[PDB]
Design a protein around this ligand. Structure first.
Ligand code: CL
Ligand code: ZN
Ligand code: ZN
Length: 224
């Protein structure tokens, strides 16, 4: 499947990557890395949708929600911020304003509270299986890396791994390490690689998606 841009408002870009899945990209202004693109994932089936990661703020989250409802004609069954930083969770309040349930790893909820961020509603201690139509997606904690709380999402039918910020794009630098566990990062991603051996598409938290090579690249980037 050839990636196709299907929406571009400059603040929000949506790229179709399978018959049923889309990457949403929003932008966070930074001091150390300029204007940073930030990825999430939308899966649709039977006029229902799952969303991994909020766009970076409420405004673009409202924009994404309006597009899923109004153009994909789909209700959003759940949103999963894959870690507590704003480029996965910064627009969580917009989702709660639409009464969309949020699911997150226990540590994401702990760190949201510690930082006085919007708090995901439904705690999972290891993994949770979420449904859109007949499709099942797994959100799962494999270990620490980019943060102590980072989780991935996996769509088994389409073999799509949303790696979140635990996964780097090919040739990426190490990025922001303030909250990272660099002693665990490679081991964590090695466990991801072994659990999803049929993976066809890997989406990083920032930059260009790819295939299984992004796991290998990330594993080696952080080998100590
Ligand atoms: Cl980063
Ligand atoms: Zn982050
Ligand atoms: Zn990130």
């Amino acid at each position: 499947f050839k990636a196709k841009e299907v929406y571009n408002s400059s603040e929000l870009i949506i790229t179709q990557i399978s018959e049923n899945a889309f990457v949403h990209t929003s932008f966070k202004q930074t001091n150390d890395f300029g204007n940073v693109p930030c990825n999430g994932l939308v899966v649709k089936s039977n006029n229902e949708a799952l969303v991994f990661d909020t766009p970076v703020n409420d405004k673009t989250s409202e924009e994404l929600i309006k597009w899923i409802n109004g153009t994909l004609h789909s209700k959003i069954n759940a949103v999963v911020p894959t870690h507590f930083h704003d480029d996965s969770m910064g627009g969580l309040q917009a989702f709660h304003n639409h009464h969309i349930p949020s699911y997150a790893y226990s540590k994401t909820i702990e760190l949201a509270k510690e930082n006085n961020f919007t708090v995901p509603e439904n705690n999972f201690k290891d993994s949770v299986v979420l449904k859109a139509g007949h499709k099942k997606a797994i959100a799962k904690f494999f270990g620490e890396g980019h943060t102590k709380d980072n989780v991935v999402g996996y769509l088994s039918e389409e073999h799509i791994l949303f790696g979140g910020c635990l996964l780097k794009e090919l040739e990426a630098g190490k990025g922001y390490l303030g909250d990272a566990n660099v002693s665990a990062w490679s081991n964590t991603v090695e466990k991801v690689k072994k659990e999803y051996p049929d993976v066809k598409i890997v989406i990083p938290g920032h930059g260009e998606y790819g295939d299984q090579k992004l796991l290998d690249y990330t594993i080696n980037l952080f080998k100590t």
